[PDB]
Every structure is written in C-alpha cells, then in structure tokens.
Amino acid sequence: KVPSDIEIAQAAKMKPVMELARGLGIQEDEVELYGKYKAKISLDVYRRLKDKPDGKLILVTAITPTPAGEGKTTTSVGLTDALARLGKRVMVCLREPSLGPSFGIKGGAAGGGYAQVVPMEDINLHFTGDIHAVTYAHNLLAAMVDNHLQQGNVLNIDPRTITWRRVIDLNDRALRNIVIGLGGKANGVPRETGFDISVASEVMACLCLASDLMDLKERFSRIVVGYTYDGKPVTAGDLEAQGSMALLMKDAIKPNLVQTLENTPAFIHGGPFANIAHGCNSIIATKTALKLADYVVTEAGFGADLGAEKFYDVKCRYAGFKPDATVIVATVRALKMHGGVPKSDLATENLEALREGFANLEKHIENIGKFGVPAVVAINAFPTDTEAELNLLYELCAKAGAEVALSEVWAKGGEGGLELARKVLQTLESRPSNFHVLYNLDLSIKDKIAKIATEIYGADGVNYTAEADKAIQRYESLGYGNLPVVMAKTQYSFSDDMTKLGRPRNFTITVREVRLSAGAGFIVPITGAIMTMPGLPKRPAACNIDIDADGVITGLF
Amino acid sequence: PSDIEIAQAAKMKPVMELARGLGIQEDEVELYGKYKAKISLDVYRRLKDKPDGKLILVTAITPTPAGEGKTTTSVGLTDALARLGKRVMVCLREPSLGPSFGIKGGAAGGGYAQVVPMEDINLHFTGDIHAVTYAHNLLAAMVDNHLQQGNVLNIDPRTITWRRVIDLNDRALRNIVIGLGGKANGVPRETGFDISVASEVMACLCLASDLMDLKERFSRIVVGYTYDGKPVTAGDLEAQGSMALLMKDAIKPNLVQTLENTPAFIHGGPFANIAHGCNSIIATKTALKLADYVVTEAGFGADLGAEKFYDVKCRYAGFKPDATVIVATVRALKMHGGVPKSDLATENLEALREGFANLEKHIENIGKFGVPAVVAINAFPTDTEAELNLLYELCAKAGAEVALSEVWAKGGEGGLELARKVLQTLESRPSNFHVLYNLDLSIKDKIAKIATEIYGADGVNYTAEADKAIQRYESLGYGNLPVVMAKTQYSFSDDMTKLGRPRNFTITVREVRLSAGAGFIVPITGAIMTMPGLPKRPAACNIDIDADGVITGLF
Amino acid sequence: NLLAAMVDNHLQQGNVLNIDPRTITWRRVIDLNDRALRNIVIGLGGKANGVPRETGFDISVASEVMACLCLASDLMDLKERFSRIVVGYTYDGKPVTAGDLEAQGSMALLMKDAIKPNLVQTLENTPAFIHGGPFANIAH
Numbered sequence A: 001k002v003p004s005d006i007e008i009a010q011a012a013k014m015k016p017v018m019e020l021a022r023g024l025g026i027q028e029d030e031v032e033l034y035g036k037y038k039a040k041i042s043l044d045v046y047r048r049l050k051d052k053p054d055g056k057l058i059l060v061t062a063i064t065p066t067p068a069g070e071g072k073t074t075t076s077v078g079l080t081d082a083l084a085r086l087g088k089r090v091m092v093c094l095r096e097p098s099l100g101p102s103f104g105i106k107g108g109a110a111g112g113g114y115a116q117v118v119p120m121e122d123i124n125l126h127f128t129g130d131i132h133a134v135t136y137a138h139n140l141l142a143a144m145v146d147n148h149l150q151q152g153n154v155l156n157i158d159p160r161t162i163t164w165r166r167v168i169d170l171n172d173r174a175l176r177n178i179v180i181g182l183g184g185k186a187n188g189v190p191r192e193t194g195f196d197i198s199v200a201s202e203v204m205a206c207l208c209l210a211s212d213l214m215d216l217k218e219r220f221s222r223i224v225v226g227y228t229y230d231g232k233p234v235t236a237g238d239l240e241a242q243g244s245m246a247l248l249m250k251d252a253i254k255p256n257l258v259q260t261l262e263n264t265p266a267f268i269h270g271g272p273f274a275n276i277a278h279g280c281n282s283i284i285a286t287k288t289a290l291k292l293a294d295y296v297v298t299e300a301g302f303g304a305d306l307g308a309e310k311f312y313d314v315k316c317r318y319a320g321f322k323p324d325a326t327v328i329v330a331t332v333r334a335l336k337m338h339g340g341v342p343k344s345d346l347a348t349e350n351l352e353a354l355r356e357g358f359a360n361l362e363k364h365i366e367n368i369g370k371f372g373v374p375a376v377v378a379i380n381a382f383p384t385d386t387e388a389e390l391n392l393l394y395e396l397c398a399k400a401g402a403e404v405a406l407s408e409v410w411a412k413g414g415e416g417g418l419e420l421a422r423k424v425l426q427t428l429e430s431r432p433s434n435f436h437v438l439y440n441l442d443l444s445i446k447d448k449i450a451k452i453a454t455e456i457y458g459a460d461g462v463n464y465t466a467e468a469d470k471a472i473q474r475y476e477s478l479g480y481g482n483l484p485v486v487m488a489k490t491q492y493s494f495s496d497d498m499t500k501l502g503r504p505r506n507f508t509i510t511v512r513e514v515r516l517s518a519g520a521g522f523i524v525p526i527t528g529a530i531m532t533m534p535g536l537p538k539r540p541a542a543c544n545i546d547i548d549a550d551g552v553i554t555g556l557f
Numbered sequence B: 001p002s003d004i005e006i007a008q009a010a011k012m013k014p015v016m017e018l019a020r021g022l023g024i025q026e027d028e029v030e031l032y033g034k035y036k037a038k039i040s041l042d043v044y045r046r047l048k049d050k051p052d053g054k055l056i057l058v059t060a061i062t063p064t065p066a067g068e069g070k071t072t073t074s075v076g077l078t079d080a081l082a083r084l085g086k087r088v089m090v091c092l093r094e095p096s097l098g099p100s101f102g103i104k105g106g107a108a109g110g111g112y113a114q115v116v117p118m119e120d121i122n123l124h125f126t127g128d129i130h131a132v133t134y135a136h137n138l139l140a141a142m143v144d145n146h147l148q149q150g151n152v153l154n155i156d157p158r159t160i161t162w163r164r165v166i167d168l169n170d171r172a173l174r175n176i177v178i179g180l181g182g183k184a185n186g187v188p189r190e191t192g193f194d195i196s197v198a199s200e201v202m203a204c205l206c207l208a209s210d211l212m213d214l215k216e217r218f219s220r221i222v223v224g225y226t227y228d229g230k231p232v233t234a235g236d237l238e239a240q241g242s243m244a245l246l247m248k249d250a251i252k253p254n255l256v257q258t259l260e261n262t263p264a265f266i267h268g269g270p271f272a273n274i275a276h277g278c279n280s281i282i283a284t285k286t287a288l289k290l291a292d293y294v295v296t297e298a299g300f301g302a303d304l305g306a307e308k309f310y311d312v313k314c315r316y317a318g319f320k321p322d323a324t325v326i327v328a329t330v331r332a333l334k335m336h337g338g339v340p341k342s343d344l345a346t347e348n349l350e351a352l353r354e355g356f357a358n359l360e361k362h363i364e365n366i367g368k369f370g371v372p373a374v375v376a377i378n379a380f381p382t383d384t385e386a387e388l389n390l391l392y393e394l395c396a397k398a399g400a401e402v403a404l405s406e407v408w409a410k411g412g413e414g415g416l417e418l419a420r421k422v423l424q425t426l427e428s429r430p431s432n433f434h435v436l437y438n439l440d441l442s443i444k445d446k447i448a449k450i451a452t453e454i455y456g457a458d459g460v461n462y463t464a465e466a467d468k469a470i471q472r473y474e475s476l477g478y479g480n481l482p483v484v485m486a487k488t489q490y491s492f493s494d495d496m497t498k499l500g501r502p503r504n505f506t507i508t509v510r511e512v513r514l515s516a517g518a519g520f521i522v523p524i525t526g527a528i529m530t531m532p533g534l535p536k537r538p539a540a541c542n543i544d545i546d547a548d549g550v551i552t553g554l555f
Numbered sequence C: 001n002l003l004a005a006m007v008d009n010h011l012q013q014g015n016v017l018n019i020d021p022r023t024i025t026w027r028r029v030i031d032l033n034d035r036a037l038r039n040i041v042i043g044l045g046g047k048a049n050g051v052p053r054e055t056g057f058d059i060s061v062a063s064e065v066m067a068c069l070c071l072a073s074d075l076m077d078l079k080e081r082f083s084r085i086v087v088g089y090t091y092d093g094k095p096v097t098a099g100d101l102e103a104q105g106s107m108a109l110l111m112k113d114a115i116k117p118n119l120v121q122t123l124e125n126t127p128a129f130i131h132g133g134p135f136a137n138i139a140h
C-alpha cells in the first residue's frame, strides 16, 4: 500500500513556515526565510522568552542497533504528530544529516514513510548552509595553523603534534592520511595530517553545545590544535582565530524551522557524531523549542547506552534541562537478532529468541531509570510480527515496569502514534521525572569512565593501554580532568565487541586511546578504532543518481 | 566616510519588489532573507523569444598597483542609466570567500557605487561556491574511490589532472600526497588543492546554458588518463548526475541591488586567466530579457577579460555586444608611462602621454571585434585639469568618445556624462560583432591570431611540452576548441615588467592544459597561482563579531 | 649517508643551527639504478621519528664525496674539503656546512683506506691504478 519514502515527500502539502512561526508566537523580524518552506529563527526569541517556563521534554532513544534496523526518527516524528492530533502544542527537534551518505549508500527521509520532516531533498543536501559554515570555520583554523608555521612559527609549535585535522562533508577515504605542505620553502611546512567528515568536526559539536554566538566563539578560543616543542598546548585563541570562525557561523547559529508531513513545526539544527561526540541536535534549537511549545520531542544517536547517556550526562548538564520522559524504540526483529537469530531467519516466529534478546531492552530501560526518568517503550510494528510475539513483548515490558505501546506511524502517520502518545501523556501526568546526571564532574576521568562502563554498559571493569594512561595523566595535568566523558565505542553491543549482541555479561571495556575536545568541553576515550571518515562502497549511489530537464531526480532516495 | 560604512547606511528595497518590478512572478523567486533571492530559469524559457535589450561590456586598461576600479564604474554606470528612466540591470561576479580572511573583503564596486548587502556577498552569499566546491570534490572522491575498487578503467593515478578545491587561501594544500595508510585506505598519489573559484566546475557553471547543459559538460570533464594514454572522463565515472544534483540551486542567478536600489545579478565568478573571467551566461541572458540595458564586466584588462568575453562567452551564447566601456585612471596610465606608485600625485604630462599607448591599443583591439568603444576616466582627487584634459584629447585623436566619471563620489549622478555618451553611441553607433577567430583553425593558429592582433606580439614560441601536449590534444579531436590564454595581466606581453605598449616582442607558451568540460584550451605563458596564501599579518586575526553582531576587522 | 643522517639527527635534536629543512641540498646516495628513490619524503611517523622533509637519492658515483676523493691530495685534504661541504641553509639564508655539524672527522675515518689507490694490471701484466670514478657532467 505505502508509497515509497521520496514519493511521500513530493506529495506532502507543506504550509509556509512563516505561518507556523507566527503560530508559535515568533515575529516576522525574527524570521529569515530560505524559500518559503524553511526559515532560520533568531536567538532573540529565546532571549525575550528566557523567563517563561519550559515545555515538557521527551527524549526519544532506541535499543542497541542491528542489521535488522529499528527506526528511531520515524518514531520521533510520528510521536510528535500524534501529540499534535491530540491538540497538544508541540515541536520536534532533530539533527541535520551529513551530505556525504546521500552519494554512497543512503540517503533517506528525516524519519520514514508517513512520519517525515520536510522538504526532504533540501535537508539531505545543503539545507540552509549550516554544514558549509562548519566546514569553512574548521578549515580556516587549519589554514591559520598552517600559515602560522609558514611565517616563522612564533608560538613555536611542533608540527608533528598537531591534532586539528581538516574536514570535508563527503565519504572520501583517500583523505584519511595525507601529507601536506610539500613543494619547498615557498609552500608550507611538510607535515602529516588528514581529513575527517564535517559532521564529525569538533566545530560541529561546539555549535551543538553553545548557548549563543558569543559562547560559541569563547569555546572556539579554547580549541586545542597542537603543542609546542616544550609540551605546552597551543589553542585557536592563541592564534586569534575565534572572531573569524565566529563570523563564518553568524547565520549557522540560528536553528532551522521546518515541518512534518502533517505540518507539525520542527527544528533541524546541528548534527554531530554520537561516538566521538554526543549525537544530539543543538541546545539552541531544543531550548528555543521549550519556550514555543508545551511539549518537545527530541532524539539522540545510536542506542540508549550512548546517545541517551550523552544526552543526559552532557546536553542537559550544560543547558540545565530535566527530561520528563524518555521513549525507548524497539523492534521485535532486532530483539530476536539480540536473541541470537540470524538476519535471514528473522520473519520466522521464535518466542525463545525474543525473550532472550529482550534482555537488551530490559537493560536499557533500567539504565533510563538510573537517571530518574520514566520510560515508555515504542514497538515498531512490522508486517511479519506475529501476535504471540507482540503479546509476549508487552508482558515483558510490563514485567519490567515500563509502559509500552505498539506504534504504526510509518504506515499511518500520526494516527499510528496515538496509543503511544497517550502512554506518554499518561506518564507525564502521573510519574514526573527526577532527573540526575549519572556522575559528578569532580571525579577522575578513570572514575567517570568506570561509572558509565559499569552502570550503563554492565561492564565488569575497564582496561587502559599505556598510551591511554599517558594521555590521561597529561590531560589531568593540564586541568582538563574535571570535564565530562564521551565514550567512543561500537554502537552494536553494550561492550566494545560488536559481535556481542543482547546483554553481555562477564566482560570488560578496553580504552586504547584518549583524545580531547577542549572546545566542546569534553574528553573522548576511544575503545575500538573510530571511523571519522567513512568511504564509498564499490557500487556507490552516485553512479545511479541523475536529474533530467524537468528536475526529476532518479537514483537518490 | 568609508565603503563598509556606506554599505550599512543603504536603504535596501526588498528584493521581491524588484523582481515583480522587472516582470518576474512570485513563483520564480526563492528568497534568501528579504534582500537576496534566486531567480528561476523559467523566466528565460518563457521570455525565450522576447527581444534582448542592449549589452554593454565594461572592461579596463592593463591592471596596475594604481588600481583602476572597474567594477565601481560598472555599478555607477548602471545607477546613471537608471536615473535616465532606462530599464537596466548590472551583472557581476561572486567573490571568493577566502580573500576576506587574507587581505581583502571589499565592496562589490566601491564608494557610492556598490551592490549590496556587501557582507553576505563576500561570505556564503547563497552558497553557489559551496555547491561548486562539493560538486568538484565529490568527483575527486569518486576518482580516488574508483582506484580503491580495483581501478576497472585502468587509470594511471599519476596522470590524474583532477585536483581538489577549497575556497580559502591555503598554500599548505598546493602540493600534497593522499591515499596513505595501507590497502584499506586508498591509493597513494600526489595531488593538491586549488581555490574553488579556479575550478573547471566554476567555469562550467558560468558557461552552461541550463542545468542539463551543465550536466552534459560535466560528463565531458577529463580527470586523467589510462596506462595506454586513453582519456577518462567524469562521464566514464558516471558522476555528472550527482554533480548536476549538487548544483540544482546554484544554477539559478541571484538578484540583489545597488545602493540606489538598481536591481543587480551576482552569479558565478571564475579565474580570468586559466578561465575567461565573466559572470554566468545564465544571469546575463536572463538579464537581457528583463531590461533594455544590461551592463556587465570581465576580469583583468581588456586583452584578457574582454577578449575572452567576446571569443568565449558571446560565441557560446550567441551574443552581440552593442558597446563597450574601457575604464582607465590618469595614474594607471602614468605607471604605464614609467612613474612609480609613490610619485603619482605629482603631475606628469609626458608620462601620461607615453603611457596612453596602452589604452590606445585596447581601443584599437575593441574595434577589431566590431564594437564601439567608450572610455571612462575614473576621476581621482590628485588629478590635475591639464592631465585630465590631455587625456580627453588623446582619446579624441584616437577616435573614441570619452567621459569623466565621479561615481565613487557622486553616485549615479557622477555617471550621467558617460551614460549619455553610451546611449548616444547606442542610438547611432551600431556594433558589428565578430569573434576574433574561427574554431576551425588549428590551436597554434588561434594562439597566433590572439598573440598578434591583440597582444601586439611579433610571434609565439612553444616548449617541447607545449608542442607534445598540443600534438596529443589535437590528436584526441579537441583541436576545434576556443583558446583561453593564461598570462600575466600586468602586461600585454608575458613579462610583468613590460608596461606601456611593448613592441617587437614574443609570447612563449610553456605549457598547455585542457578544459573539455568548459570546452576550451588553456595555453600557459607564466606559472599560474591557482591557490594563493594568507599573508604574515592576516585579517582573520583582527576579525571579530561581538554580542550585537557588530563586525570589526573585516573590511 | 652518515652526513645525511647527521643533518637529519640535527633537526631531531632541536635544530640549534636553525636550518630550514626545505633548503637541504645534501641528498642520499646508493650505488644501484633505482629511480623510485629519486624523490621521496623522509622523517614520517611522528615526533619520535624525524622531521618530515622532501629529499631523494643519487647514485653513489655521482656523490660530491666521490668528487672530493678524486680531487683530494691526501686524507687531511679530503677532511678539510668535507668540512666545506654545504648541506642546506638557515631560515635567515646563511649556509650551513658539514664542518658546522662536525662531521668531517667521521667521514674522514670512513675513507681512511679509500684514500689509497688500487694497483691492478692489464691482460699483458702492465701495472694500472683504478681509483675513484665520478660523473663527468655534474663532475669532472
């Protein structure tokens, strides 16, 4: 029945965003249109409503990702729409997609099926320019570092200690490890460096954590690029780059007003990695949205062991938010993959594997309660699921003390989200949250890692390479030790081993390397090897993409 | 009284107003805030047969440290024509972001002849360049990924001519090695970056007729060769769809205005050596339907921008320039007279009278295309009346109308005298446009008719590399293409020391490159800087924006 | 190659002579026809491993050290000459020599037998010296 995803995005009737904005109580002079279906909202809206109370905050998360797929944003949008159908005054805030994937494997809707934010095609490409803003702010600093050396290197940097890489928003592996500054004395200083994908830029994380443009510049001034020969850090502040970087982001700092297929207003703004960063959209968008609405849905990247953790222990920490509930999105099939059933055999009913894989969901639910937040499970309905499966899954959610609702937002838009929405409102009305970050900043890095690892991952303990132990000593010594902690780990297990599905017991995390983001204001311990610059596949989608004389776009979505 | 100041104090009409003022519907306008917008190509298609208005190329005499002010004069001529009740718009190039952080960050034009909002124009504007940058870099990545995947096309990574771009002055990226890290990480090869406005993809945007022609062009782009020597194209990599896609918006020209609310287009902006330094054909050809008068410009002196304006931009689009302006200063002609930069406040009636042979050549050159030339003598406070008056006479004795232009100071009123001379030249002096050469010649005959007629050189020489590159290019059937001379702009010759009108000299062609996508051949005489660098005290260090959005240090 | 390796170690230890590594003219040598060594980049791997710089190899008979042997009067003259070999420049533009790196005694040491000419004969037993052998374009 259901048209494809791009098909649905064409036939959406979209309201002029200017209207949606006056509807929320935003003035015309706080609105910079980008065409008629996108706008950029002033930070002055927040400033004039600073003293208003916040709407309710509803975090959407998910169980441990899998081949089987789970659909988190589809649930978020269609949760938002269901809320709107019940007369509630609500917005959803979401991350902007990286352009790159559009040409490799993806792209796909912001959400899916009948639960989307739109215009789809602008959001997947240049949208309102936020990522080029980031790309050029990042690269200017790189180019300032490099020019610095070229002009006699006054700060007495060691070019081999330089951690500030370049960025480009394409999946281009050949740029991972390069050598720059070749050609002779007139041409730079030979040094080893490389590129990361732009959404993985620390500059992207600063935008997503900054309170305004002046806070964003301040943060920029504390970005560490490298070291001197004596071992002292050198910052962007020291190069006096922050005013220029700030300049390049003067529009980028404004969140982007768009809507859902059903015309529910929505902000898309920022969009960082959720392993080396926190995988949330801008504080700016979410804080603005809490004034305009009585209800705000937002999501975080990867599973609840990562995004949800970092949403609480970093995003709210900084903004001083207090989530009111959190929705855990789950699928009967992924639970079975967690129960040990292979991809191909996931349609076959198997109540045993479902129950045994349910431990993945049970552990997350328990994790959400460790922050003092009531949890509601959404079940992403799928045609193969039997009733005996769906029912077992409710008992189980119930046995574990969580409300649960079957969700059909993909097929039925906001109507499929109403059972769930009623369980949220029902939860909001009678189990107010008691929000608490998992850990205190004045612990030691090793303390804060174990906390996360043992309480959230169910890890026995943590191991550390010499390189790790040394970084930590050095960082703690530079006074960056009372900072929050951002675990970069595989999203496919609670553990650092992507093969360990379900709820692995009797295991241990191993920290190979520790990096720093003094701009964003956090420590990044790394367990696997992180891909901060993925590559295209052998048959990339760029080969099948076209657009004809009437702008008909085949091969993209 | 500074230029940024004057840019703040502009009473800017909403763009939407002008668009419908020009007969554009509400649905052909995609606003970017109230004072910028993009016009749809449907405006051209639906007025396809309505008549072009008049085409007035502005150009200039040979560049100098005196700084002649070519754009300012274009903006101030457009303002003038508007004050005379004439339906007119100007078409100009979008400036690179990068320079704003090195030394530059200037007005589109100057003084009281600007196009606004100045600060968005120098920054992200409407993202035309990021569209270019990503369309270029996608392709690079596609080439590199190809190799990673078994290199089916059997490319020689060392032949690869397709570089990357970024729109910052970053000299550290000029020569790099990529693809390191081992079999998982690409294929080691030497390459580099070039500023984004120097892209072939920028050139293509500025010559493409529509989005599909832009795509077709991309298809023909050459990225390198196979081990056998067979060229390999973006078409072979099936990349043109994806590049066209990333440019669906950038292909539309951007409506903005002047300080006196005269509608303006800013669309495209390429290099004027390895390319042809014009704004997009799209913008000017849309602009021809929306007015009776279109002013536009081309990069560097008339020997380059103007030659390539005529022999490339017009050839492709089938335009017929009705008049041409040649800007000049008294002080610039005095540099061409031998007087150094420090001493040019001093009157010097001989140096102006030996230096005038530069302008006298350009004017003779404009006459070779069958175009009526008119001079503009950009007025300056230190210019004597005897100097100015010697100039008129010399322009007159050369058989060209001339007018004083005080647009930097007097806005559109300063440019009335010129604007009248132009309209007088248009009402009675009809151009008979003719490209300087025919495409059916061999490459070397085209460089020669260029070198001789325009640059006034006695002949042309060729290194072995040049002869072989031509031999091969001609051998691949790219012989029947126009020619885009990559030469220093500071002389008629290939020697930047030779000011004035050098006689009895030669051009030497060291190297020859191709742009099968833009559809021309690029002979190189000097070495061309495709990636400048930041200076010792860059302007990014004092650039700042405060709690109120007030911006210091930029301009 | 010892000198090359002394130049490179110099930079690694804080670069007191304040050389510009991009001005270095002293290349390496190997006595094989190996084109892939013409243009290399050395000193990669990070702070513990040298200073990234562009250099290359020439064939050993084309070494300036070969020419000094072929022009020196004895071993002490050969060392003296070694001390005047120019390797590169400082940032200010002043030349830096092997003498300045105090390499000449070691280079001299490595050549203490090499300085002696080699007695051999012709098929018909006529005595003959073979000794040295430089390029005749960039040398004599």
Ligand SMILES: Nc1nc(=O)c2nc(CNc3ccc(C(=O)N[C@@H](CCC(=O)O)C(=O)O)cc3)cnc2[nH]1
Residues within 6 Å of the ligand: A071, A380, A381, A382, A383, A385, A386, A387, A390, A391, A406, A410, A411
């Ligand atoms: N990607 C994707 N995601 C989806 O969620 C999806 N959903 C459908 C349609 N999904 C479904 C899911 C469940 C039932 C179903 O068995 N519903 C039960 C109700 C269960 C209960 O309330 O306990 C029924 O029989 O009514 C039907 C269709 C089709 N394609 C999809 N594709």
